[PDB]
Design a binder for this molecule. Structure first.
Ligand SMILES: *P(=O)(O)OC[C@H]1O[C@@H](n2cnc3c(N)ncnc32)[C@H](O)[C@@H]1O
Length: 642
DNA sequence: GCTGATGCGTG
DNA sequence: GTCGGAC
DNA sequence: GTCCGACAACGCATCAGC
């Protein structure tokens, strides 16, 4: 209709044709997307964000259906389906260089402003490009921007960075109004709308339900909910939402789903897109549980099983009819080339009656000499891309815990009791290569407590807890965190807790813009009377506690570090702090660090020690830095892990 | 040919 | 990965 | 409970710079 600068997708009674800012068949302008992002970021209520995105999506369906897929990817800040592994190869480094060049400003000035504002988008938006001619280029389109992001991602090899920067600069030259803000945020990986995958799916199912695709233009049906009561409309949209969600969870690939949606409609979608070996599916996740009593409350009177939670990496293993094997990560990345050793062992793990399967396993580093699990850190030293089986140094043992598909049968809707029985009967254990997760079926609190203790003695993180028959399916769309995770470090007063000295602060980004988002912590090295950086810290405080930290630390800001504070390879703090505050910090584990100097030389000649999953517990007002946890005590904690 | 910075990705 | 905020 | 985005350590792969 008129200028996209006035586009209002949050408008009441939004009409997909009359309230759009482009004409039928025209390319969706990128400014329409940016204005939608603005209206989403302005609100706190997720369902209001969904309504606003739905409005844009309904206009796209009604007016410009070829742009639906790029608009969806822009809204997710994705480049394509996850198993294809497209990635920009752009972070703040390349982006800030491009912004500096685009605006003719010094890199260090742009970088400082980005830190201060806590958002690269605001820096890119408020500076004019020294390349822009008098007459600007034509307005950016949603599909055009998306294609340029993909162009950036496809550039590889020597001198590819300069080519990426040229594309980015070209985008900024053509930006108008709020566009540069969101192109910059997209490139930095921090769109930070408050709306992500689940809201995008809800907006999409609502949009195609209210404004059906494939109508002769002008569409006779622009709002198919209008003839329903609010109550009936709600039930209908919820049911349509679940159709899309369950399909996506089984086939998380918009390249596959959107063409079907536009051609056949949402009600027919599950006939055309179904779970199948070779296509990765969304894995079941776990909800953290802070005690066995919380477990029993959550699973009330539902029989459940406890399993060791192995400390490795998830491997979703697919065997297709015909013999091909694929392996995917928890995030649906294709890891087949990383595990030639697993591929060769598949004939050894499955009985010959098994013709196809999808297995849910943990890959764990395994010492064949000592016949014992090795730490996560050892597993991460595996090579990633096209490994050959002869060159493997770190062997892996698979710990299998679920079966999602068998001999052409999807088990998504089957109870774990049956899925587990099919797993145990149709696959073959080999010690140190493929074994079923150690498990316990019980409701006795004391057996569970002992099992949790035993899992930690047996090199695991704690327990997974899973119902066997009540709400015990693998339907991620119904509940994505259907399993519980119980770790010792969740229990109040249990686990590795340290008192550490605050030696630096980092300016916050995004939700933390305008205050500190993170802090640099140190342990006390008695031998050298130095404070040694041990880790950064960025979670565990409430918003109120974070404002209190900002107040209590402001007087401690130094221009230059104290001579007895050693940070070696740590990120230099934005504000150095006079060592004074002592905070209680909890972690899951201690790790040998390539950068942190804490306790260097006490366990390893070259490496100090850091904290895995550190979080703030409380301030120790009754401790001064000389009573903080010592670097010797840190070393003792690390050795005790064995 | 090598190294450190950068990016992606796992947890 | 942990965590807290908004719903 | 769900969803989201602040923030953690640290591995391999890649590429600019040398
Ligand atoms: P997040 O804290 O959601 O943890 C889930 C991951 O735990 C791993 N895992 C190890 N052992 C198990 C068992 N027995 N069952 C399920 N998941 C397990 C997986 O890698 C998960 O992704």
């Amino acid at each position: 209709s008129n200028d996209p600068s006035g586009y209002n997708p949050a408008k009441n009674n939004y009409h997909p044709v009359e309230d759009a800012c482009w004409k039928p068949g025209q390319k969706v302008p990128y400014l329409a997307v940016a204005r939608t992002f603005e209206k989403i970021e302005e609100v706190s209520a997720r369902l209001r964000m969904v309504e606003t995105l739905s409005n844009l999506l309904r206009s796209v369906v009604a007016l410009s259906p070829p742009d639906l897929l790029p608009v969806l990817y822009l809204s997710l800040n994705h480049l394509g389906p996850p198993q294809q592994g497209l990635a920009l190869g752009v972070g703040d480094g390349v982006l800030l260089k491009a912004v500096a060049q685009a605006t003719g400003r010094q890199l260090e000035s742009v970088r400082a402003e980005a830190a201060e504002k806590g958002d690269v988008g605001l820096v890119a938006e408020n500076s004019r490009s020294t390349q822009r001619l008098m007459l600007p280029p034509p307005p950016l389109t949603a599909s055009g921007v998306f294609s340029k992001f993909r162009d950036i991602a496809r550039l590889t090899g020597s001198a590819s960075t300069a080519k990426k920067i040229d594309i980015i600069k070209g985008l900024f030259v053509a930006c108008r109004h709020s566009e540069a803000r969101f192109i910059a945020r997209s490139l930095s990986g921090r769109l930070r709308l408050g709306l992500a995958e689940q809201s995008v799916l809800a907006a999409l199912s609502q949009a195609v339900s209210l404004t059906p695709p494939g109508q002769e233009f002008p569409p006779a049906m622009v709002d198919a909910g209008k003839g329903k009561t609010a109550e009936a409309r709600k039930t209908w949209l919820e049911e349509q939402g679940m159709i899309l969600k369950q399909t996506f969870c089984e086939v998380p690939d918009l390249d596959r789903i959107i063409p079907v949606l536009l051609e056949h409609g949402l009600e027919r979608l599950p006939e055309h897109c179904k779970l199948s070996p070779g296509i990765p599916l969304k894995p079941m996740l776990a909800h953290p549980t802070r005690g066995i009593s919380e477990v029993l409350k959550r699973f009330e009177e539902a029989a459940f099983t406890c399993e060791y939670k192995y400390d490795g990496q998830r491997a979703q293993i697919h065997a297709l009819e015909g013999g091909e094997v694929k392996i995917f990560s928890r995030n649906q990345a294709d890891n087949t080339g990383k595990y030639p050793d697993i591929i060769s062992r598949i004939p050894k793990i499955k009985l010959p009656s098994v013709t196809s399967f999808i297995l849910d396993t943990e890959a764990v580093a395994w010492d064949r000499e000592k016949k014992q699990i090795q730490p996560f850190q050892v597993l991460t030293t595996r090579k990633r891309k096209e490994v050959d089986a002869s060159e493997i140094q770190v062997q892996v043992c698979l710990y299998a815990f679920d079966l999602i598909y068998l001999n052409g049968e999807s088990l998504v809707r089957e109870p774990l009791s049956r899925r587990r029985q099919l797993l145990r009967e149709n696959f073959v254990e080999t010690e140190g290569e493929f074994v079923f997760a150690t498990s316990l079926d019980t409701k006795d609190i004391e057996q569970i407590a002992e099992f949790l203790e035993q899992s930690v003695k047996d090199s695991c993180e704690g327990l997974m807890v899973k119902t066997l028959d009540v709400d015990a399916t693998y339907e991620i769309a119904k509940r994505s965190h259907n399993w519980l995770k119980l770790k010792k470090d969740y229990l109040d007063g249990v686990g590795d807790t340290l008192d550490l000295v605050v030696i630096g602060a980092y300016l916050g980004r995004g939700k933390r813009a305008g205050r500190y988002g993170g802090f640099l912590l140190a342990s006390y090295d008695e031998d050298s009377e130095e404070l040694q950086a041990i880790c950064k810290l960025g979670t565990g405080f409430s918003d109120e506690e974070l404002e209190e930290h900002h107040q209590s630390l402001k007087a401690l800001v130094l221009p230059s570090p104290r001579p007895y504070v050693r940070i070696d390879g740590a990120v230099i703090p934005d504000h150095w702090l006079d060592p004074s505050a002592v905070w209680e910090v909890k972690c899951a584990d201690l790790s040998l660090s390539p950068i942190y100097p804490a306790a260097r030389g006490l366990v390893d000649s070259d490496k100090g020690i850091s904290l895995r999953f550190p979080r703030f517990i409380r301030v120790r007002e009754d401790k001064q830095p000389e009573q903080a946890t010592t670097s010797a005590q840190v070393a003792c904690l690390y050795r005790k892990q064995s």
